[PDB]
Amino acid sequence: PMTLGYWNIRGLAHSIRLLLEYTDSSYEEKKYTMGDAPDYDRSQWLNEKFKLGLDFPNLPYLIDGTHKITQSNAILRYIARKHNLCGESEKEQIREDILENQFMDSRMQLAKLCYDPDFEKLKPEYLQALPEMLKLYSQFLGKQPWFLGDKITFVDFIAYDVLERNQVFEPSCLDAFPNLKDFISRFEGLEKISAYMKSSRFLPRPVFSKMAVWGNK
Amino acid sequence: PMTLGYWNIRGLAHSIRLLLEYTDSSYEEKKYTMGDAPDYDRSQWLNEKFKLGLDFPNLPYLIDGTHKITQSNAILRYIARKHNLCGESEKEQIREDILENQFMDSRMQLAKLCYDPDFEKLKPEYLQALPEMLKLYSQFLGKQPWFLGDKITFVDFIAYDVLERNQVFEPSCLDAFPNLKDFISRFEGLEKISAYMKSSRFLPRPVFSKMAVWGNK
Ligand SMILES: N[C@@H](CCC(=O)N[C@@H](CSC[C@@H](O)c1ccccc1)C(=O)NCC(=O)O)C(=O)O
Numbered sequence: 289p290m291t292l293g294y295w296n297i298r299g300l301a302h303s304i305r306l307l308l309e310y311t312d313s314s315y316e317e318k319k320y321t322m323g324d325a326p327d328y329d330r331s332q333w334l335n336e337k338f339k340l341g342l343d344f345p346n347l348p349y350l351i352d353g354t355h356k357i358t359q360s361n362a363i364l365r366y367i368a369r370k371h372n373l374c375g376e377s378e379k380e381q382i383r384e385d386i387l388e389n390q391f392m393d394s395r396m397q398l399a400k401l402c403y404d405p406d407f408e409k410l411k412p413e414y415l416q417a418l419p420e421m422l423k424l425y426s427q428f429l430g431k432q433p434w435f436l437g438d439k440i441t442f443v444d445f446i447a448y449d450v451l452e453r454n455q456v457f458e459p460s461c462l463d464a465f466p467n468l469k470d471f472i473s474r475f476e477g478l479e480k481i482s483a484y485m486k487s488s489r490f491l492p493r494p495v496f497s498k499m500a501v502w503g504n505k
Numbered sequence: 506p507m508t509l510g511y512w513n514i515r516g517l518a519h520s521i522r523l524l525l526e527y528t529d530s531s532y533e534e535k536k537y538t539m540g541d542a543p544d545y546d547r548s549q550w551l552n553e554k555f556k557l558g559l560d561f562p563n564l565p566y567l568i569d570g571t572h573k574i575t576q577s578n579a580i581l582r583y584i585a586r587k588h589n590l591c592g593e594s595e596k597e598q599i600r601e602d603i604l605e606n607q608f609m610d611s612r613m614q615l616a617k618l619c620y621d622p623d624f625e626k627l628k629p630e631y632l633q634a635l636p637e638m639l640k641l642y643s644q645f646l647g648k649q650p651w652f653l654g655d656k657i658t659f660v661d662f663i664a665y666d667v668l669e670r671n672q673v674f675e676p677s678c679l680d681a682f683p684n685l686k687d688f689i690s691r692f693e694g695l696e697k698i699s700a701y702m703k704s705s706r707f708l709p710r711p712v713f714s715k716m717a718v719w720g721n722k
């Protein structure tokens with residue numbers, strides 16, 4: 289089978305779910321539910337973490353036949369290669385590698401904030417820096433429909449998740465960046481993406497786990 | 506020649522310097538130096554961060570003619586592709602992606618600890634977890650000379666850095682894992698690596714920046 293294992297939240301699995309849907313993959317999900325405060329029990333996961341044959345047990349994981357893959361970027365690249373959704377030219381591969389890692393840094397900046405006990409005090413600093421962050425992505429995208437040019441590739445699924453999560457956080461944040469606004473709309477307008485988003489499989493919320501200060505519900 | 510820009514420390518540039526040396530690359534280093542405590546003045550970098558033509562200005566960066574690259578993994582992959590130092594088969598590419606990301610997680614775990622003011626109280630937790638972490642890498646390597654099999658590739662440069670840095674931190678940590686010990690020796694014994702390491706250009710210390718509680722010198 290093809291099985292995606294992750295917590296029952298958006299988190300690091302959003303881009304993977306969207307890519308599985310876009311590629312018309314035949315997959316099922318193993319959803320782990322963290323317990324409520326105060327214990328935030330992880331037993332649903334911990335009771336099988338070491339029983340799945342994973343080399344480096346973690347969430348998310350993808351099982352595809354005999355392939356057992358962890359690390360969200362490795363999972364995305366695996367699916368992308370399977371469906372010819374990677375950068376082709378050297379210049380495209382450079383952009384792909386820069387963006388995969390840059391978007392991960394941006395993702396981690398937001399996650400660090402949203403789990404920080406000092407969230408309320410720290411949020412203004414994040415918001416002050418947000419337009420500059422977005423400006424750099426806007427400049428890089430330029431006039432192209434997708435981040436690697438005319439063809440959609442896996443890094444667009446990363447880009448969508450990170451950019452759209454920032455819109456959930458600060459609704460107006462993309463408004464100053466026409467190309468980013470149009471990118472979100474173009475992605476959500478893709479046939480398989482809009483089909484997914486009208487279905488009960490779509491899991492836009494909670495953004496983060498039960499322990500988060502923001503995005504826990 | 507190419508320009509490699511980074512702080513005047515080991516940090517995220519160790520694997521890149523080693524890969525540049527292994528590939529006989531012509532390069533010069535632009536070395537930045539941080540100020541002292543408590544402010545850790547970054548002016549030497551910040552005063553030219555936006556004057557270098559980088560799309561997402563950061564350290565490390567690599568300038569190779571028209572190619573201007575940030576994100577350490579992107580720099581490594583760029584050099585690796587140029588010299589056929591990447592996984593070839595699907596299984597090799599999956600291993601490569603898992604390890605690139607897994608080693609980054611390990612790297613960040615040690616850096617998070619060593620930069621934490623509460624270093625002393627937090628150290629036992631890291632050290633107790635270390636054997637498990639290394640066991641997983643040892644199991645994955647098995648009897649192979651290199652992490653992707655019989656061919657050395659860029660992920661070996663990442664592996665060497667992360668494993669050897671842990672040996673600096675905890676001198677005995679690889680002793681229980683003969684294949685990891687032997688891997689370190691094999692990497693260090695490559696002609697071009699050995700020549701570099703025995704030269705004055707090799708920069709094993711400081712491990713981290715001036716802000717670190719451990720490895721700041
Ligand atoms: N670099 C890895 C990070 C993987 C990771 O941090 N995984 C977290 C859940 S997501 C990170 C974050 O969204 C999250 C969600 C829910 C709980 C904790 C953290 C996890 O629960 N791993 C299993 C384990 O440690 O046993 C990756 O990209 O896959």
Ligand SMILES: N[C@@H](CCC(=O)N[C@@H](CSC[C@@H](O)c1ccccc1)C(=O)NCC(=O)O)C(=O)O
Nearest residue numbers: 389393512516517562563564565576577578714
């Ligand atoms: N994901 C990125 C991380 C890049 C990064 O965190 N770079 C740090 C110095 S290294 C991280 C670490 O070794 C370090 C070194 C020195 C000081 C603090 C931290 C930096 O100083 N960037 C310049 C900037 O943000 O303007 C990468 O892999 O290249």
